[PDB]
Amino acid sequence: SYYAVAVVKKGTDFMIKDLRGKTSCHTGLGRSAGWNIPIGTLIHRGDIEWEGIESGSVEQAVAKFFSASCVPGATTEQKLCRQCKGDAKTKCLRNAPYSGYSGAFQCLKDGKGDVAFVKHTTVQENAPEEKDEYELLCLDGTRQPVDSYKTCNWARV
Ligand SMILES: O=C(O)CN(CC(=O)O)CC(=O)O
Ligand SMILES: [Fe+3]
């Protein structure tokens, strides 16, 4: 079991309703915590306007919402690769430097995204001496500490 969480830095003050126009770090296209849960959550609050697939791409809809992102595996929207770290031709592949739970978290740490969609063990696993520099974005419009995932997660997977 795990809990999908949205990690942000303590220096910022935006909440979930204020995500439009921010930059985002994702584990990869089509993965659970990094894409299916957050994007679906945003589509259902009505923040990302997608009503259905007509030629319709979710990628297009997301690229319109975030100003830029890193979404390893993205196929059609270059904006979704803009924040990725790496070489000109592989930075956006599904096994790129910012891919995976560790890579999405590094993208936030490096300041290449304002939010990283990862799981509840991610900050602890990758920056245990820096946990206090991060917090989580809750569905109810607040922020809570990294260890408070049980009451501040977007879904239990
Ligand atoms: O995200 C996925 O699509 C698949 N997962 C499990 C999961 O997150 O539930 C394995 C992994 O990404 O390593
Ligand atoms: Fe996963």
UniProtKB/Swiss-Prot annotation:
GO BP of this protein: antibacterial humoral response; iron ion transport
Subunit record text: Monomer.
Full-sequence portion shown in this chain: 91 to 247 of 686
Gene Ontology CC terms: early endosome; extracellular space; plasma membrane; recycling endosome
GO MF annotation list: metal ion binding
General function of this protein: Transferrins are iron binding transport proteins which can bind two Fe(3+) ions in association with the binding of an anion, usually bicarbonate. It is responsible for the transport of iron from sites of absorption and heme degradation to those of storage and utilization. Serum transferrin may also have a further role in stimulating cell proliferation.
Paired cysteines (S-S): C25-C107, C70-C84, C81-C92, C138-C152
Organism (species): Anas platyrhynchos (Mallard)
Localization of this protein: Secreted
Family: Belongs to the transferrin family.
Protein name stated in the entry: Ovotransferrin
Keywords: Disulfide bond, Glycoprotein, Ion transport, Iron, Iron transport, Metal-binding, Repeat, Secreted, Transport
